[PDB]
């Protein structure tokens, strides 16, 4: 209700950039090893977005060192330091789950040139 909505509004971030499924994004997240705290970049295609207010999330898929890796980021998590869109993709679905069966040329996504 109003109470939970207020509790979530006071936690939501304010500078989340607009991105759509099919966009290539770079997400810089905080990695804490021992006592040193740095940023690690995860770059890949957004294949799913779950718009749920404070509970919003998005899935990014990349091919790292010959393996396919999907990471689901909570958008308003403090661990997600930054999100940037490196390339705008042109798809027609809200969930690009069919990319999991495609590799190389078959997995290419056309650029949304406007």
């Amino acid at each position: 209700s109003n109470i939970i909505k207020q509790l979530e509004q006071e936690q939501m971030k304010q500078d989340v950039p607009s991105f759509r499924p099919g966009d290539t994004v770079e997400v810089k997240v905080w990695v804490v090893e021992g006592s040193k705290k740095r940023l690690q970049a995860f770059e890949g295609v957004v294949i799913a977005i779950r718009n749920r207010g404070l509970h919003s999330a998005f899935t990014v898929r990349k091919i790292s060192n010959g393996e396919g890796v999907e990471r689901v980021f909570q958008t308003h998590s403090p661990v997600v330091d930054s999100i940037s869109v490196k390339r705008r993709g042109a798809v027609r679905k809200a969930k690009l789950y069919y990319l999991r069966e495609r590799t190389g040329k078959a997995a290419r996504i056309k650029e949304r040139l406007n």
């Binding site: 999330a57 393996e67 396919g68 999907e70 909570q74 998590s77």
Partner: peptide, 21 residues
């Protein structure tokens, strides 16, 4: 070292892989 089910991070994030290794 890698699972399709994946691992879950303290903030709720989940890392998944395409194979079990």
């Amino acid at each position: 070292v890698r699972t399709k089910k994946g691992v879950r991070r303290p903030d709720g994030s989940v890392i998944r892989f395409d194979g079990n290794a």
